[PDB]
Design a protein around this ligand. Structure first.
Ligand SMILES: [Mg+2]
Ligand SMILES: [Mg+2]
Lengths: 100, 206, 114, 151, 127, 98, 79
RNA sequence: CCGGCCGGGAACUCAAAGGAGACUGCCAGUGAUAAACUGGAGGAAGGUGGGGAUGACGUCAAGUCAUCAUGGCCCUUACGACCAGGGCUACACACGUGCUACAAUGGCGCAUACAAAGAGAAGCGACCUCGCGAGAGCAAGCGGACCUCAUAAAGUGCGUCGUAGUCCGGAUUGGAGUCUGCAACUCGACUCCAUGAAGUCGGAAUCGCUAGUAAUCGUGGAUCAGAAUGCCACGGUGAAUAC
């Protein structure tokens, strides 16, 4: 729960989607079957500048309330310890405990 | 940690839900986060006014928030100005229209969370934990309580160590998967340290 | 039985002999028999030399044992002269098929000395 | 265990010809659950034994059943502490299973060709009393004759 | 005329239609020797008929699926008994003694937490 | 024409929500088809519980998501006149597809 | 193995050599981009490849054609 | 144009709901005629029939203040903040759980059967072109009992291999490559071509299992840009013994 670390995800996500990660104009065009022209170098010409801060592969895709890199679930938004506590409390529509 | 939460096992069987909205696996996290944030903001802003439980619902993205309290006179405030104001806050935080519904509890000693909040407020006053717990349980049993179990753990009374004390009056069948019970927990950060409470109250059979 | 001048893969199918040959294994045996026009269900002790010389010529196109280890040694010289991390790992005389060495490399690091 | 004293399951006979003996004989050699090949090989071996002996299968082995099946076993109840042989009566309920186990142990030997050739060969050797499964029959007899009237 | 038999061992759904006049067999438009006539359970589908009549009195049309070979083969061994109702009294009071009528409700127990399998406990150390 | 496919959480809720639809479209809506069971998904997965340690502690939570179909065949206008902005059994998700 | 269309290189590494090759580079170069490979232009160099505590100076030979800089950075001290 | 493809039926599998039934219910007998237990017929289902979550007071002042919070305390232009690279993958060595093998109830090649369960929208991606191949281009359809992942695999037969480290087995590196992500050696995975060990089924000692279980065969889900033999699940074939 390091504030700073949580902020790190914040500054990561604040520019990833605002920038090349969705604005993938430069790489998308370049890395293809087109001519082996200057475009090959041009590709990394932008990436050297690119804030490393911003790309999807970078972000950990972790929880939000706790800020915990592990146990997170891509489908709920929180860690295991918190999602279970909310589940057996009732704040998870239609989710309950079953057996086989 | 071997005792199961005796409501997670009864939610989809006999107990009512609290976050009711169906959707696809694209907005689950966002909706649940908005709900959690607004709900903790509500339990922070209206704590002193008996919020017994707070249930949520999201129909076609015009959400409903039901708040079961015991002091609606102060919740509504002046003709509901505070209500319509909190309606702005919920809509701002959730990005959607909001509809608030205030429900009233008759005897606040019917809500485990409410009695736990009472005990939490009492134990932050250098009060006698026994004179609080026994008084609450007898207050419940007099008006009628087919079962009650109230446990308190921590540095109670300055024990300086991990100490727990529970009081039982009636039948509290936490193993029978047929009944309806009320249960919740609270925490008091007395200057000694924190003190946790566990309150189960058993009235229903079906 | 006589291909390469040295190897005698006798009593081996037309392809089993080539697989047993030093220099090539499973695939080049079939490639050789295909480019030469022979089946892969008969031993080598039945084929005459009029075809064995052709098999010899057909295998004389790729690198051979006499040059297999020479190319390997050339790559090893490249590594040792570069001094790369791989060159060092090889010059320390350790097993060679991959990357992991700490706790499971016993196969070519031999048994424990102490 | 200690509470229950239940017995053994029922045996499902062969779909070819009713033989719980042969069903157990096959289940003893059965391994890993890959039963298609096991059945395909055992039935082939047995239909070959059929002509190897001149008679059908259910009787081809009935001649070596006695050669293999002994009449004694060993159970060492500690006497103030004891762990050596102590002769006892063998249970015929599972003596057939013990014989099926010994004969397959022996058939795994003679190993040069496939099973279909070697298990039938070992059963024929047992019929002429020439198998290690037939020798186990006397081995246990020797081990039992040593300490008579023990318990 | 026409009699329907349902079958179900080990998730294996079997759907049988039996008629009088012939005694042929067809498994999902396939023959017995075509699918498993010389494999495991190559005869269990005939035992219920071999008990009363198999050769040419009652001809069959089968559709089995939903699992393994042995599964579908026991599914037929069952569905035959369910289709055998034209003389239900004599087809049941006689066969119930030999079996072939039970569902054999056997289900593979799920992968169990902690356990590496349905029943195997992982390996210990004790030290 | 209106391929009606709805998704809900509970069966005692999806049935109660289909009841009013299959009553409205019959009193006005000209003989819709028959409610269809549509096999369902539950998302049976293993999650985790204990803090820090005891990997052998797990929980098996599920979300039984029921599915149903109606497939109104008559393209009458009273169908839409009755299905005009109504949401019953809040906590579910229906859809009007043609 | 690596990129199929265009060997990946960094600009801080490229530009410092491409333009100084006309001068001879006269000196080492502190490389913080060890994730790059070599090409016939980058030989004759005396570059200090970062390896943690410091930058190891290395002379470049024509044999280092398709190898990276960190390929020989000894962070494996081991005595 | 045999594709339920098109009419056609809701006969049938299947489907998601609502119910049915099973209970010692009935008969025999050792037994305090009690209870109970072996048995017997009926019995889709036999003795809590499937199993599953359910962990009672409590014990280790067990573990966790690095899920989270709070006390008490320390620091604070620093125990705080940020940037690049290395590390946790460094290994003479100890130990522990798993995948692979030690082969002929088996390896190799042809064709050849049926699963079940779950996933899939800045995602699953048929078809089709190219490429031995890893994948690369065109790219519908599908937010889904319809479109995709996605071909189950051991098996079935045939032919070969014929007891040798042998067509076994496959490992810690060569060379050429394929994808991921800016980025693939320090430190990803994958194919191909090539070399090919140890191990000939294992000492003391020790581990699991009472049935659709053990044993194995594959399949999918998480996490995830990529990254398992591991974790969690699906179903396939299929034991022995419990004196
Ligand atoms: Mg080594
Ligand atoms: Mg401890």
């Amino acid at each position: 729960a390091k504030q700073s670390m949580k902020a790190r995800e914040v500054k990561r996500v604040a520019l990833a989607d605002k920038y090349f990660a969705k604005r993938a104009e430069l790489k998308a065009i370049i890395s293809d079957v087109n001519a082996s022209d200057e475009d090959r170098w041009n590709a990394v010409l932008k990436l050297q500048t690119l804030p490393r801060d911003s790309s999807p592969s970078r972000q950990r895709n972790r929880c939000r309330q706790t800020g915990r890199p592990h146990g997170f679930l891509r489908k709920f938004g929180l860690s295991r310890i918190k999602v279970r506590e909310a589940a057996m409390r009732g704040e998870i529509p239609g989710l309950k405990k079953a057996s086989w | 940690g071997q005792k199961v939460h005796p409501n997670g096992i009864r939610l989809g069987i006999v107990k009512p839900w609290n976050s009711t909205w169906f959707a696809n696996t694209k907005e689950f996290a966002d909706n649940l986060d908005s709900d959690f944030k607004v709900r903790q903001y509500l339990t922070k802003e209206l704590a002193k006014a008996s919020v017994s439980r707070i249930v949520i619902e999201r129909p076609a993205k015009s959400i409903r928030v039901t708040i079961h309290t015991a002091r609606p006179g102060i919740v509504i405030g002046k003709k509901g100005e505070d209500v319509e104001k909190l309606r702005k806050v919920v809509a701002d935080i959730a990005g959607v229209p909001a509809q608030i519904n205030i429900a009233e509890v008759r005897k606040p000693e019917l809500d485990a969370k409410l009695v736990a909040d009472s005990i939490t407020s009492q134990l932050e006053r250098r009060v006698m934990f026994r004179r609080a717990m026994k008084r609450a349980v007898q207050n419940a049993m007099r008006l009628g309580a087919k079962g009650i179990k109230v446990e308190v753990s921590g540095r109670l009374g300055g024990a300086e160590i991990a100490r727990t004390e529970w009081y039982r009056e009636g039948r509290v069948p936490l193993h029978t998967l047929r009944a309806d019970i009320d249960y919740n927990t609270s925490e008091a950060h007395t200057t000694y340290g924190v003190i946790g409470v566990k309150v189960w109250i058993f009235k229903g059979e079906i | 039985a006589r291909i390469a001048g040295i190897n005698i893969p006798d009593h081996k199918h037309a392809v089993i002999a080539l697989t047993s040959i030093y220099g090539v294994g499973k695939t080049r045996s079939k490639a050789i028999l295909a480019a030469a026009g022979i089946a892969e269900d008969v031993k080598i002790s039945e084929l005459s030399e009029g075809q064995i010389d052709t098999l010899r010529d057909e295998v004389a196109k790729f690198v051979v044992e006499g040059d297999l280890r020479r190319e390997i040694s050339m790559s090893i010289k490249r590594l040792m002269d570069l001094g790369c991390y791989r060159g060092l790992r090889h010059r320390r005389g350790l097993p060679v098929r991959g990357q992991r060495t700490k706790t499971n490399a016993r196969t070519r690091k031999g048994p424990r000395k102490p | 265990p200690r509470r229950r004293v239940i017995g053994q399951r029922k045996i499902l006979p062969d779909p070819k010809f009713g033989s719980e003996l042969l069903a157990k004989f096959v289940n003893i050699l059965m391994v890993d659950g890959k039963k298609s090949t096991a059945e395909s090989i055992v039935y082939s071996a047995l239909e070959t034994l059929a002509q190897r002996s001149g008679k059908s299968e259910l009787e081809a082995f009935e001649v070596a059943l006695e050669n293999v099946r002994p009449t004694v076993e060993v159970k060492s109840r500690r006497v103030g502490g004891s762990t050596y042989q102590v002769p006892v009566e063998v249970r015929p309920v599972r003596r057939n299973a013990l014989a099926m186990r010994w004969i397959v142990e022996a058939a795994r030997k003679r190993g040069d060709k496939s099973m279909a050739l070697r298990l039938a060969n070992e059963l024929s050797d047992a019929a002429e009393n020439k198998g290690t499964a037939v020798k186990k029959r006397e081995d246990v007899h020797r081990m039992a004759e040593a300490n008579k009237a023990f318990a | 005329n026409q009699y329907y038999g349902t079958g179900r061992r080990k998730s294996s759904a079997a759907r049988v239609f039996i008629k009088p006049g012939n005694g042929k067999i067809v498994i999902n438009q396939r023959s017995l020797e075509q699918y498993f006539g010389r494999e495991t359970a190559r005869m269990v589908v005939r035992q219920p008929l071999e008990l009363v009549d198999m050769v040419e009195k009652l001809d069959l049309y089968i559709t089995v699926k939903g699992g393994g070979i042995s599964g579908q083969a026991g599914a037929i061994r069952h569905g035959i008994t369910r289709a055998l109702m034209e003389y239900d009294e004599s087809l049941r009071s006689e066969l119930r003694k030999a079996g072939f009528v039970t569902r054999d409700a056997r289900q593979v127990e799920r992968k169990k937490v902690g356990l590496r399998k349905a029943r195997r406990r992982p390996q210990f150390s004790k030290r | 024409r209106i391929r009606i496919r709805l998704k809900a959480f509970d069966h005692r809720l999806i049935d109660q929500a289909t009841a009013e639809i299959v009553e409205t479209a019959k009193r006005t809506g000209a003989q819709v088809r028959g409610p269809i069971p549509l096999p369902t998904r539950k998302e049976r997965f293993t999650v985790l519980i204990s803090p820090h340690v005891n990997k052998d502690a797990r929980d098996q939570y599920e979300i039984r998501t029921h599915l149903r179909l109606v497939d109104i065949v008559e393209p009458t206008e009273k169908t839409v006149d009755a299905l005009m902005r109504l949401d019953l059994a809040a906590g579910v998700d229906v859809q009007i597809s043609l | 193995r690596s990129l199929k269309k265009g060997p990946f290189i960094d600009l801080h590494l490229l530009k410092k050599v491409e333009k100084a090759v006309e001068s001879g580079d006269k000196k080492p170069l502190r490389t913080w981009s060890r994730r790059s490979t070599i090409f016939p232009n980058m030989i004759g160099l005396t570059i200090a490849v970062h390896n943690g505590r410091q930058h190891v100076p290395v002379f470049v030979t024509d044999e280092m054609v398709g190898h990276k800089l960190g390929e020989f950075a000894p962070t494996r001290t081991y005595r």
